[PDB]
Amino acid sequence: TEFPLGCSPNVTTPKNGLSMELYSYDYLKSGSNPCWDAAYLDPNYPRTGYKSHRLLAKVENVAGNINFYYHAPMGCTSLFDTLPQAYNYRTPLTMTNFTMLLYGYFKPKVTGYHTFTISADDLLFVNFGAGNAFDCCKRESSADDFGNYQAYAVWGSQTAKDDLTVHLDAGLYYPIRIFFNNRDNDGALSLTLKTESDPNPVIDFSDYFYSFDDTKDGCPGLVSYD
Numbered sequence: 001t002e003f004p005l006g007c008s009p010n011v012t013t014p015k016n017g018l019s020m021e022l023y024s025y026d027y028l029k030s031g032s033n034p035c036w037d038a039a040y041l042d043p044n045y046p047r048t049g050y051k052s053h054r055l056l057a058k059v060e061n062v063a064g065n066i067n068f069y070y071h072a073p074m075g076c077t078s079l080f081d082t083l084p085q086a087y088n089y090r091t092p093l094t095m096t097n098f099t100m101l102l103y104g105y106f107k108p109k110v111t112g113y114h115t116f117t118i119s120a121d122d123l124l125f126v127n128f129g130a131g132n133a134f135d136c137c138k139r140e141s142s143a144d145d146f147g148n149y150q151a152y153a154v155w156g157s158q159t160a161k162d163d164l165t166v167h168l169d170a171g172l173y174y175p176i177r178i179f180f181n182n183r184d185n186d187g188a189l190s191l192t193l194k195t196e197s198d199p200n201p202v203i204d205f206s207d208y209f210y211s212f213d214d215t216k217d218g219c220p221g222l223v224s225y226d
């Protein structure tokens, strides 16, 4: 989907940042082999499965540089540390093993081709565009209905990095859904953006992430090129 669908909320003053939900990702019993839970690889773990784990927090206004690398002191051990400031979540959590979901809308600054590059330990699955992530101003009623991943990265597999090159209009807000998991040990998340004119990758998404309330009618995009 080189031409993803965007949305036109036409809201007075849009809310900055994405929404985030954190969930437990416990280790297997302390004599299991391997030590980590393999659920994160089940096809429905990112859709239904994470809901069977403990909710840690629902957070709003996630904006900034969301990238991090966490070096675990040791493996097969649940250890506590903190996320970067952009996450709006200040208390220590199990950085060695956890599940994290982000959702909202991406707003381009400049119309044209955008390349989002991702890499992750252990997993990062990205949906992008109306329908694919969720429907315009109808997130709640389409929350679990996301399509094929527009990018996906799994540590240790023959696709440990991925990118997505899409033509975007600055006039639209694009549904986005980012699902992360760390199963054990080190954790890492990299999202960068490359546009055709700007020389270097963008890593600070402060001005690009937004949240909008759902509306009865929805808010389909009012820019189209057919």
Ligand SMILES: CC(=O)N[C@@H]1[C@@H](O[C@@H]2O[C@H](CO)[C@H](O)[C@H](O)[C@H]2O)[C@@H](O)[C@@H](CO)O[C@H]1O
Pocket: 036, 074, 075, 076, 121, 122, 155, 183, 184, 185, 186, 187
């Ligand atoms: C493959 C494997 O299990 N490696 C062990 C380490 O755990 C993995 O580490 C990688 C990072 O290199 C990654 O984060 C993955 O999610 C982890 O499961 C770790 O357990 C280490 C113990 O000191 O030993 C490796 O065998």
Ligand SMILES: [Ca+2]
Pocket: 121, 122, 182, 183, 184, 185, 186, 187
């Ligand atoms: Ca890991």
